[PDB]
Design a protein around this ligand. Sequence first.
Ligand SMILES: Cc1cc2nc3c(=O)[nH]c(=O)nc-3n(C[C@H](O)[C@H](O)[C@H](O)COP(=O)(O)OP(=O)(O)OC[C@H]3O[C@@H](n4cnc5c(N)ncnc54)[C@H](O)[C@@H]3O)c2cc1C
Ligand SMILES: Cc1cc2nc3c(=O)[nH]c(=O)nc-3n(C[C@H](O)[C@H](O)[C@H](O)COP(=O)(O)OP(=O)(O)OC[C@H]3O[C@@H](n4cnc5c(N)ncnc54)[C@H](O)[C@@H]3O)c2cc1C
Lengths: 119, 152
Amino acid sequence: SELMPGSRTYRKVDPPDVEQLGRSSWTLLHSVAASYPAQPTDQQKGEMKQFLNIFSHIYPCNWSAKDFEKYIRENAPQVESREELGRWMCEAHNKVNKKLRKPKFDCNFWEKRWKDGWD
Amino acid sequence: EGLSGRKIIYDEDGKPSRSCNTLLDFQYVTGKISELMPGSRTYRKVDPPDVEQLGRSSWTLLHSVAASYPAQPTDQQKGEMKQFLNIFSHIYPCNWSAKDFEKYIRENAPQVESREELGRWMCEAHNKVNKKLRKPKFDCNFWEKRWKDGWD
Ligand SMILES: Cc1cc2nc3c(=O)[nH]c(=O)nc-3n(C[C@H](O)[C@H](O)[C@H](O)COP(=O)(O)OP(=O)(O)OC[C@H]3O[C@@H](n4cnc5c(N)ncnc54)[C@H](O)[C@@H]3O)c2cc1C
Ligand SMILES: Cc1cc2nc3c(=O)[nH]c(=O)nc-3n(C[C@H](O)[C@H](O)[C@H](O)COP(=O)(O)OP(=O)(O)OC[C@H]3O[C@@H](n4cnc5c(N)ncnc54)[C@H](O)[C@@H]3O)c2cc1C
């Protein structure tokens, strides 16, 4: 709300809660999926697996990071194509929605929501 | 300390916690110390995030990652953090920006020995983009207040 000393721009905005961090993490995760190649190289396939493994270790919320890691074991990420990684990212997201009684996102429209837009 | 209130479950760190609890509920505890997408009525059709939206959404995570970082991290956490930033610099959606950030890591290696080192590094990295975009230079001495603790 009110400014920092001694900035004439940056304000005393509080550290993110679950919701502010959540939608910010989802927008990155889904945007990474959208930028993923149709035919990824072995290095890209390896790093995508790594990034998500590390992600589940360091996520700011601790047992949400555990829940995500446990999800990765029970549901291995498909990194063979953008379409698979994106659909997997949507299905991974859909589980958190189910836990929060938020409606299911139609994964048929993940590529519009995160890559293409709607005409 | 309240276990349940306002419908949701409270996570407690040493005591207060921040990242795992909603804003309205966090105040509640610290105060106690004294058109639509087809097939769904719920989700509006939303255009994908632009450079600016993705950018600031990536920063809030990256600094929150620095905020959660331990004071004395294990050797695994140091190496994983290093990889995390490298992989990030490759797979960051904006290619022309990702290549720049990758070059920054080459020239200015991440200091991951402590949270104090990492937040200071992250702030400087953010500040380099700040100068490139002609935004004001953020005071790193206040990164903890902005991203970790709050403003008392
Ligand atoms: C890994 C992870 C674990 C989390 N765990 C918890 C937790 O345990 N408890 C908790 O309270 N919060 C948790 N969160 C935060 C939570 O998931 C939400 O992000 C937060 O509650 C804010 O939700 P929102 O209503 O603003 O929209 P969000 O759920 O953040 O989604 C933002 C936008 O993305 C789109 N979207 C939603 N679902 C999908 C999907 N299936 N596929 C494609 N697009 C979609 C929608 O259009 C929506 O507008 C977690 C977040 C992450 C990233
Ligand atoms: C790795 C990376 C590289 C990027 N490269 C480019 C690029 O090359 N060109 C481009 O146009 N865009 C780039 N972006 C996006 C750009 O940095 C901004 O995020 C975007 O322009 C939105 O700016 P903003 O002013 O709305 O918020 P941001 O500049 O993203 O800042 C968000 C919040 O963080 C806080 N903050 C600001 N500076 C610091 C700091 N130094 N340390 C700690 N906290 C701070 C402030 O409170 C601010 O409200 C990049 C993003 C990332 C994550």
